[PDB]
Amino acid sequence: EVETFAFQAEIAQLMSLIINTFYSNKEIFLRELISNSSDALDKIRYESLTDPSKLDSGKELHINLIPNKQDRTLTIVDTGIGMTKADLINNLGTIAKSGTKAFMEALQAGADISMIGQFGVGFYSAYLVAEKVTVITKHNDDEQYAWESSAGGSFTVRTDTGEPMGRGTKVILHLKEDQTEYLEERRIKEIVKKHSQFIGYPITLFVE
Ligand SMILES: CC(C)NCCCn1c(Sc2cc3c(cc2I)OCO3)nc2c(N)ncnc21
């Protein structure tokens, strides 16, 4: 049972720029996603200090990197705060509007795509390497949802009847045909060591 939504014009614009601009340093997408996971984990930890029951959905706070050549996907999994339906459909977009505006102006002023994180919109860097991104997420007091978008100005959201995750987010990157290097263990290990060696949570890189 799928609902389809239009990205706010600004977000659609950011995505086009990301997909269209010639920029070779694509590997920064992983750092942006791992960072978002780190932030989510930080929040659920902080919240658990005043309400321990919030960890009933899972006490483990970590990150998993799962590559799959068969499906040509790279999934970044975390046990963080998760996102609600309201987050996925309106709230995160509202916030992303200002970040986008600032980021695009900063670019014209000499900045580059690798700085997208300082504007709160790093998630969209996933499109530097993915033709389609599917996001499975579960927040403590909402249901598990599946958000998805191949850009083009729209995204869908549905209640996920798959396999329960308890609490957290899974960013599934359906890679572009010429970006399969991100499925190789050596390459992923290289990027993590280069841009995310100090994340304060365990990061497990699965092998195939
Ligand atoms: C609330 C605070 C933690 N900031 C969260 C920003 C949204 N977000 C993001 S960035 C993001 C993710 C999206 C999205 C928009 C953004 I911005 O629509 C598709 O899924 N990653 C998160 C994650 N791994 N866990 C929880 N929240 C995530």
Q: In sequence order, what are the residues at sequence separation of 6 or more whose Cβ sits closer than 8 angstroms to the Cβ of residue 166?
A: 57, 58, 79, 138
Q: Of all helices (H) and strands (E), which one includes residue 9?
A: helix 9-20
With 0-12 / 13-18 / 19 or more C-beta atoms within 10 angstroms meaning exposed / middle / buried, residue 8 is: middle
How many A from CA of 39 to the centre of ligand 1?
9
Report CA-CA distances (Å) from 90 to 18, 95, 119, 185: 21, 9, 18, 36
Neighbours of 9 (CB within 10 A): 11
Q: How far is CA 109 from the centre of its chain?
A: 27
For this entry, resolution in Å reads 2.1
Residue nearest atom 9 in ligand 1 by C-alpha distance: 36
| Closest by Cα among 116, 80, 119 to 96 | 119
The structure's method of determination equals X-ray
Q: Give the residue among 93, 102, 128 at the shortest CA–CA distance from 9.
A: 93
3-state secondary structure of 170: strand
What own/partner pairs with CB < 8 Å and gap ≥ 24 does 114-122 have? 114/25, 114/28, 116/28, 116/32, 117/31, 117/32, 117/35, 120/95, 120/96, 121/14, 121/96, 122/31, 122/32, 122/33, 122/35, 122/36
Tokens of 202: 């365990």
Contacts of 134 (CB under 8 A, 6+ apart): 146, 147, 148, 172, 174
What is each CA distance from 73 to 42, 132, 173, 182, in whole angstroms? 26, 10, 5, 9
Spatial distance between the Cα atoms of 146 and 101, rounded to a whole number of angstroms: 27
In terms of Cα–Cα distance, which of 122, 114, 101 is closest to 38? 122
Contact (CB, 8 A) for 137 and 157: no
Where does ligand 1 bind, in terms of residues with CB under 6 Å?
Answer: 36-37, 39-40, 43, 78, 80-81, 83, 88, 92, 96, 121, 123, 135, 147, 169
Domains in the chain with CATH codes: 1-208 (3.30.565.10)
**The token pair that represents 97 in the structure block:** 């509007």
Contacts of 51 (CB under 8 A, 6+ apart): none
Which atom of ligand 1 lies nearest, measured to the CA of 121?
Answer: 17
Among the listed residues 2, 7, 3, 1, the one whose alpha carbon sits nearest the alpha carbon of residue 150:
7
In contact, 179 and 13? CB cutoff 8 Å:
no
Query: Residue 127 in contact with residue 116, Cβ under 8 Å?
Result: no
Q: Cα separation of 170 and 77, whole Å? A: 4
Q: How many angstroms separate the alpha carbon of residue 171 from the centre of ligand 1?
A: 10
Structure tokens at 197: 């060696």
C-alpha distances in Å from residue 119, one per residue of 2, 82, 100, 102, 192: 30, 20, 7, 7, 21
Strand partners, 181: none
The CA 93 to ligand 1 mean position distance, Å, reads 10
